[PDB]
From a paper:
Established functional assays were utilized to examine the effect of mutating the catalytic cysteine (Cys50) of Ssp1 and Ssp2. Isomorphous crystal structures of Ssp1 (at 1.85 Å resolution) and the active-site Ssp1-C50A mutant (at 2.2 Å resolution) reveal the overall enzyme structure and details of the active site. The protein is a monomer in solution but crystallized with two molecules in the asymmetric unit, each consisting of residues 1–163. The root-mean-square deviations (r.m.s.d.s) between least-squares superimposed Cα atoms gives an average of 0.3 Å when comparing the four polypeptides in the crystal structures. The copies in the asymmetric unit are therefore judged to be essentially identical and neither mutagenesis of the catalytic Cys50 nor crystal lattice packing interactions induces any major structural changes. We conclude that mutation of the catalytic cysteine in Ssp1 and Ssp2 abolishes their bacteriolytic effect because the dl-endopeptidase activity is compromised. Furthermore, we can conclude that the Ssp–Rap interaction does not depend on the catalytic cysteine and that recognition of the Ssp effectors by the T6SS machinery is also independent of their enzymatic activity.
Author numbering: 1 to 163
Write the structure that this text describes.
Amino acid sequence: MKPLYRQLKSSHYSSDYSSPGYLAAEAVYAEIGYELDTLLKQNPGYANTAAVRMSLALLKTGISFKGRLPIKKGAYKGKTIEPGAKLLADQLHRSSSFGKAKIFFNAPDAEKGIGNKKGVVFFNKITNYDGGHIDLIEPENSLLTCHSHCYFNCKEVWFWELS
């Protein structure tokens, strides 16, 4: 299956404090049975939580992929999380669930290509930001809004439309 935008959103923990769907990074990891501080010590990359948030949301709407972090607690125990944005984007890109992304190389193209659609967005090689960002995007007042944050100052914008 391919998830519905509304339900993927409902199942997605925003890292934006002012979002109705906000959840702190430590609670996200606690949910799947990890202490954030232990993980950061093992690999500081875990501070970038976008792919973990998206992974978990995808799982809850029934999309499974290979990942590299086993969930150790809760309903999804035994399933895997992909903590790397690029690696998650690659999964989606080859999945039959989503298919190939539309890939944009500048902000005008990205914005016109997304248009009034909604879906999954991946910001690749973001200026002054490490690890990329994968998120949900939709229109809001003729602008585009991301559930956590948009990073249009980047080298590539990948987009998968959802209904």
